[PDB]
Design an enzyme around this catalytic site. Structure first.
Site: not given
Ligand SMILES: [Zn+2]
Length: 348
Positions: A165, A172, A183, A185, A271, A283
């Site tokens: 990931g 998704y 959150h 990243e 975000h 992603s």
């Protein structure tokens, strides 16, 4: 402080020739000041496509679906993930487009935004999130999320460590009302996010230069959690209304992402957002030379076993060799200037 003084989310429309060098376009948009907003939209050339057709993926397996349960009030919510048994995309689509779960009817997105914040604790949706996968087809050489060409994969080229990931692609599959919480990243990396097909995805962003102020608010509101983890927002469980952000003077922006578009989140950019209806997004994380400082200063999840944690050691040693002995001593007290673009932007 001069490029993008309002600190708003910008949008860029690269030409096919500009599009081909990924790292170089990120350096471009940062020269334009995109990173101040913490989030940016990038529309690909009309000529470009990542895959010929999405007709043949309905037997794709979503191994660990999540039911998103949300408790809370007055703009502040906690989101619990219940894992349900695997299902194929078809089973997901059908569930998503059913009337129990379909998008409500609406006119302007503002009304869809109010419906979301009005009904987010009712009718817990299912999010086919965190599916290991790519929908790019092998030959696509521009902006392939499977192989973006960044200094990030010194993690697994030179240290041989697969962080699923973070430097491998995620899929998704969402439906109406499915959320991702506030959150940054992992390791405060960049992320990229292409929406393959389906209904839109709406984003909220807090400028990295005001991120500490977002963190203070959440500590106030979830004192119990703040006590347990240095970085409890990394649990991706906490949802805050735009009404609450406005109320407490935390600056932010909104943007909606359409099928065929890229979102970029920037280091230490907070975000959040929600999906409008059935869709599919892909992603992964990535990095630039500017990220190296954020990497080092990243506060991480103390709560756990499993925090994604990356040995900063290899990066400092290569791109910052004149501070490595200092850093290893623990006396590296470099202060981050969130407005400064990545050095790769010198040319632009
Ligand atoms: Zn935590």
């Amino acid at each position: 402080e001069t490029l993008n003084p309002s600190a708003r989310i910008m949008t860029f429309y690269p030409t096919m020739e500009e599009f081909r060098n990924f790292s170089r376009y990120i350096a471009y948009i940062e020269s334009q000041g995109a990173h101040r907003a913490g989030l940016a939209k990038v529309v690909p050339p009309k000529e470009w496509k990542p895959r010929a057709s999405y007709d043949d993926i309905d037997d794709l397996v979503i191994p660990a679906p999540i039911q998103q349960l949300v408790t809370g009030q007055s703009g502040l919510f906690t989101q619990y993930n219940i894992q349900k048994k695997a299902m194929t995309v078809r089973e997901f689509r059908k569930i998503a487009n059913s009337d129990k779960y379909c998008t409500p009817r609406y006119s302007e997105f503002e009304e869809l935004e109010r419906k979301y914040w009005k009904n987010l604790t009712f009718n817990p949706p299912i999010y086919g999130a965190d599916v290991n996968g790519t929908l790019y087809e092998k030959h696509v050489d521009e902006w392939n999320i499977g192989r973006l060409r960044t200094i990030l994969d010194l993690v697994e080229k030179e240290s041989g460590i697969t962080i699923e990931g973070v430097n491998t692609p995620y899929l998704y599959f969402g439906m109406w009302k499915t959320s991702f919480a506030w959150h940054t990243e992992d390791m405060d990396l960049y992320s990229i996010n292409y929406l393959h097909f389906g209904e839109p995805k709406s984003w909220y962003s807090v400028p990295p230069e005001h991120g500490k102020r977002l963190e203070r608010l959440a500590k106030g509101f979830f004192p119990g959690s703040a006590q347990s983890c240095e970085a409890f927002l990394r649990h991706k469980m906490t949802l805050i209304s735009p009404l609450m952000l406005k109320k407490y003077g935390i600056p932010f922006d909104k943007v909606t992402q359409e099928a065929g578009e890229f979102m970029i989140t920037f280091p230490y950019g907070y975000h959040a957002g929600f999906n409008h209806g059935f869709n599919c997004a892909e992603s992964t994380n990535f990095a630039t030379r500017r990220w190296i400082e954020y990497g080092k200063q990243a506060v991480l999840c103390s709560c756990r076993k499993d925090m994604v944690k990356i040995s900063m050691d290899v990066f400092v040693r290569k791109f910052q060799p004149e501070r490595y002995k200092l850093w290893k001593a623990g006396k590296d007290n470099t202060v981050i200037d969130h407005t400064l673009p990545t050095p790769e932007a010198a040319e632009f």
